[PDB]
Amino acid sequence: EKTYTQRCRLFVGNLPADITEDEFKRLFAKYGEPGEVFINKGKGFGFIKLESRALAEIAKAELDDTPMRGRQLRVRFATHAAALSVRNLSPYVSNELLEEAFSQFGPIERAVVIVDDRGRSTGKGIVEFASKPAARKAFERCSEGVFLLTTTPRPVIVEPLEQLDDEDGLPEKLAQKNPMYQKERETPPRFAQHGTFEYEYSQRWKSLDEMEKQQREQVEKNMKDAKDKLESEMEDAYH
């Protein structure tokens, strides 16, 4: 579990211009003792670590989209700076096996194996360390060397985790910053009908996307056939 981890840090954006270090703590007062507190008084955002992930998820759920001296607050979890993308996993790697494996590089905040809608592993996973240099060590040694998890010499591919945001997307209020957003909205959503000036090129875009799909599915099919032949010649493990 551990207290005041990086998974407990919350991002509080759109703060008032005259926000102070102690007033920012008065917001999260009823969530225990505040941990590391930093605020960017210029841009108007700040970070704060809570005692546990549970307290952080409760404070995020209660304080997000709430007013403060006029401005609406944007509360979310800060982007984990020590997160690594783990892929090329065998379908027999668990969360504990993934955590026990990468624990030798440093303290593990969390380690999960991404699964599909049924529960089967997708061959990819996520590992989050307590410090960024700990994740850098795991990223370097796994890429410079060969790190195995099972008996099969299937190496693990470690990359920096591209953390996307599918919770709070891109609100329209933030989209009004660019003037061309309103210029694009001059035409409402529609279906391109034949005979239109834009119909000829809409079908060419859809044809280009179909060409991209056919080429990428051909590449991903050749790797699967190559990955299956490696496990076939492995049966001939004798030198």
């Binding site: 759920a61 008996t151 891109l170 959503p189 279906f191 391109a192 996307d209 490696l230």
Partner: protein, 247 residues
């Protein structure tokens, strides 16, 4: 813990599938009123489904906030000797939207796909620096509305803005990075613990062949990135040329 109100967000639709909680490993001696009493703290509850013989069920709270608070307080909590398994239920009518135009927003994506049914939530995926990734999520109220949007956009070109590039609509491939894979069954692979292969051994030699095709796909996936890139700029040049053409 304890805190009160109904915690509605400005203009939030209530009793959506986002506030739908799956409660597993329930004791076999539980009723509908008993599970409502367990969630009585978290406000008004809508639908309540129960499978008494199997030990699971569904309950839909008012808002997403009340469901997240009920999850963190009731997950892995003992009840009649058994630990509760509280988890957000998977959205049955969720759609993935790719190839979004440059200027998009959550409200634009919601207003656009609202022509196929009642949209519960629409989100434009953004990266670390707030830039859109080109992918989006559209969640409908029911399955027929999601299939209607899927069919109309598969055979027709659905345009969101002025730019004449249609978006690609696919069924949402629900990936779980929360519960993960805690444990599984016996398909021997774990005779040897995780380790670094010694350079020169058969494990090191054979694993380097695995890294070879991994980076081989990276070059092929980047080669098709260039093939689509040059055909894209050719099409965009042909559009700006036709933009100047007006009789």
């Amino acid at each position: 813990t304890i805190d009160l109100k109904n915690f509605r967000k400005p203009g939030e639709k209530t009793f959506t599938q986002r506030s739908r909680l799956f409660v597993g490993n329930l004791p076999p001696d539980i009723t509908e009123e008993e599970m409502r009493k367990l969630f009585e703290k978290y406000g008004k509850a809508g639908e309540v489904f129960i499978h008494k013989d199997k030990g699971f069920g569904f309950i839909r709270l008012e808002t997403r906030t009340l469901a997240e608070i009920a999850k963190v307080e009731l997950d892995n909590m003992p009840l009649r000797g058994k630990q509760l398994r509280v988890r957000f239920a998977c959205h049955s009518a969720s759609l993935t939207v790719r190839n979004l135009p440059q200027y998009v927003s959550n409200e634009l994506l919601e207003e656009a796909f609202s022509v196929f049914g009642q949209v519960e939530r629409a989100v434009v995926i953004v990266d670390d620096r707030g830039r859109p990734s080109g992918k989006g999520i559209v969640e409908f109220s029911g399955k027929p509305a999601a299939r209607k949007a899927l069919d109309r956009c598969s055979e027709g070109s659905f345009l969101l803005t002025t730019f004449p590039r249609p978006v690609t609509v696919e069924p949402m491939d629900q990936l779980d990075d929360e519960e993960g894979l805690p444990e599984k069954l016996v398909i021997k692979e774990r005779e040897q613990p995780p380790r670094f292969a010694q350079p020169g051994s058969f494990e090191y030699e054979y694993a380097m062949r695995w890294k070879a095709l991994i980076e081989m796909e990276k070059q092929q996936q980047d080669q098709v990135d260039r093939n689509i890139k040059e055909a894209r700029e050719k099409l965009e040049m042909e559009m700006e040329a036709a933009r100047h053409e007006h009789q």
